Structures are given as structure tokens and as C-alpha cells.
Design a protein around this ligand. Structure first.
Ligand SMILES: [Cl-]
Ligand SMILES: [Cl-]
Ligand code: NA
Length: 129
């Protein structure tokens, strides 16, 4: 599923990400934009052989099992395929764990390089929330 911008802002709000660990809604929408272009089916293989899954490109090296990332962990306790669903539950719940783990949203390189310190409220401007 490719979400619309305000459609995803709303879904992320309903799923509990507005101001989660202190990050406003616009930070999450910006990260999803640059991670996946709002596409729940996005996958991108990393040089280390791990793979990134979903709207927030959660990596199999730490967070999910895909059965093909030697030596990896599965800290969110899900199959990586769960992160590809039209329903963003598994992505949001795993992203909550990630953002809680010490480096906040810097875990998402694309947030750090493209959203961090910008006017992220622009990503929610004009959405019915
Ligand atoms: Cl594996
Ligand atoms: Cl933080
Ligand atoms: Na894994």
C-alpha cells in the first residue's frame, strides 16, 4: 500500500506515534517519506546482506527475522514480512522499540540526514488530525 501523506499521518497518530519518545508526528511522516516513499512494501538490501523492510525500513540485522541474515537478532519478535502489511501495526510497534533503545530517531539514517532539525511540521500541514 502506498499511503497518502495525511492518510499516513493520521494512521501513525491512531497507532500512537505522535510525540512518542518526544518525537512529533511530523518526524515520523518525514522518516517514512524518505525511507519508503510511504510504500508499505518497500524492501532494500544492505551491503552487509541484511534487508530493510516497510514504511520505516526496519533492518533484519537487529529487529525482525527474514531467515537470510546470518548472525542477526529479532528484537521486535516478528517476521520481517509483517513489516510489509497494509496495516502498519507491526511497523509502528517495532519502531517504538527502536526509537526507545538509546539513539532515538537517529536509528533511521534518513531521518538524521533529511528530517532532523528541519521544519518537520510541514509534513502534517493541512491534514485532518
Ligand atoms: Cl536470519
Ligand atoms: Cl531522543
Ligand atoms: Na533478524
Amino acid at each position: 500500500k502506498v499511503f497518502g501523506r495525511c492518510e499516513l499521518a493520521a494512521a501513525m497518530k491512531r497507532h500512537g506515534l505522535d510525540n512518542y519518545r518526544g518525537y512529533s508526528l511530523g518526524n515520523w511522516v518525514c522518516a517514512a517519506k524518505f525511507e519508503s516513499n510511504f510504500n508499505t512494501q518497500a524492501t532494500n538490501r544492505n551491503t552487509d546482506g541484511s534487508t530493510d523492510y516497510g514504511i520505516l525500513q526496519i533492518n533484519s540485522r537487529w529487529w525482525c527475522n527474514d531467515g537470510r541474515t546470518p548472525g542477526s537478532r529479532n528484537l521486535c519478535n516478528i517476521p520481517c514480512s509483517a513489516l510489509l502489511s497494509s496495516d502498519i501495526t507491526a511497523s509502528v510497534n517495532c519502531a517504538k522499540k527502536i526509537v526507545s533503545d538509546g539513539n532515538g530517531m537517529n536509528a533511521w539514517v534518513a531521518w538524521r540526514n533529511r528530517c532532523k532539525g528541519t521544519d518537520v511540521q510541514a509534513w502534517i500541514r493541512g491534514c485532518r488530525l
